[PDB]
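Components:
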Amino acid sequence: KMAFTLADRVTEEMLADKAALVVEVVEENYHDAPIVGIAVVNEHGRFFLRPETALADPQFVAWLGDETKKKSMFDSKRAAVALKWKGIELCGVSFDLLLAAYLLDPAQGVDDVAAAAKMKQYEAVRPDEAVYGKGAKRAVPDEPVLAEHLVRKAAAIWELERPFLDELRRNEQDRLLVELEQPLSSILAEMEFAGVKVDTKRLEQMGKELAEQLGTVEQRIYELAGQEFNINSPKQLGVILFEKLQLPVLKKTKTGYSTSADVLEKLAPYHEIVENILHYRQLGKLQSTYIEGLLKVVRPATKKVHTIFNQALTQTGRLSSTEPNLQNIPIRLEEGRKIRQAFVPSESDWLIFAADYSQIELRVLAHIAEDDNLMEAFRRDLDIHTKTAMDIFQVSEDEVTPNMRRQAKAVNYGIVYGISDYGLAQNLNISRKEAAEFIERYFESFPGVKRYMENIVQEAKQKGYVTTLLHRRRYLPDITSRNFNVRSFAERMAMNTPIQGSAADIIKKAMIDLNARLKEERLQAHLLLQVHDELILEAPKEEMERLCRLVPEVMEQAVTLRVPLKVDYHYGSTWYDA
DNA sequence: CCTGACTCT
DNA sequence: TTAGAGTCAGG
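Structure:
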């Protein structure tokens, strides 16, 4: 039961200084996607507008871009970017119901207004899926039906703003929404719309050479196997390895024999076909994903790729990156790393600039756990992987063999992922008795870190959630489960979430601080990408000297911890060279 | 459509 | 029996 005006022209009363606004984009990937309808709810009434009408009306465009005209929305970044593709600027967004719901409880997986409304028992709006349908049936409904839906979403947003802000304020998360997530949303919109330029001539040539190489390795595998088979079928592969070649079975999953990389690496001493298969699967992923999959999403006229940074998805406060994912481009092996030669500046005589925090999660552990030894080591900037090696091996720094340090590495992060003796033994391919001693020795050497792990788990049990430095929360209702596996997993989330989530908080603030300094100083440099603990920029070559000063400082000063934050940086002609 | 593989932080 | 993610081919 809800009255509204199905308008055929914009009127002055639609342009009030406070409104709920819906700019509807049905396609999941909102880059260059149709806007199918608009709804406005304000003190004067409820209005639906056809986009052809509204977006061509100079007063409505003026209103959209007037920062003093405040809009309440759901997923304002989607709207903002879709409008950028329509050549229209959206300003004055004061409340984003998507981000408010996300901060209240990321586990709800809220991704439409109806799901947010459910959190406050508000039911006068339908789910998007119920209106548009799914898969090949997905379609925009008849105008009267669309209009009612959009108007109901706007009225829900209108009514839900205060209840959500009130609950955020109670949680000490109001400033997290208003001063961190909402400002970041605008910075992400800019980054997404800018996109990253791709050197398609180079990428296509890499793909042509890769196809030939894959072919060679493929035939070698068939030769070694005595038979052709589909290497990319774990099922067929399992028959070859474990039935035909009779290699030991080290692990099974629900569907059959495991052929995971960890497993195959341990089989290398039995047959040379296993190293070839590992190489083949690496090369094939390069081909399928970073050559072919990437070329599929390049906008041909501009040679740019435009990712979407999902800001309201991860359980810890990280971003994710989709279609394409530009946060998992290869780097570890030179063979894959060369993909980065295809990512280039968007203008002649510009360069790529990349800065990353060094061991931010470990410096966060040090802060939160107030562990003296760990804090001391970072204060002197003693190498952290060598410090741990000296303790779990019980030797002086000058006795830390190359492999001892690398063994201490995986212990160092492994502790922050809740690693068991079994897992550490499987990782380093070492004695499980020794793996247990390594862990034992670590926690006796970093008693503060040990105290934290015990304390944070007890807190999770008492409160039902854990929190980050800037008051992000994660609820862990399974932490008291009687089931060992369920409970143990939740305890590891209790240990890790405050650390990963705090590191996310810090880089988000650094992004907001950096943008502000860039704009103030009128630098042409701008952000392209965030990769969890790294920021990627492009800028004219003349600005490198400045950025070498500005970017590391901003990132290092974003928060003040009990240990220093450290940032490394490099630049060059392609992402590879940075 | 899910599973298991490779990719990153 | 190691935290958080996305995309892919195969089944």
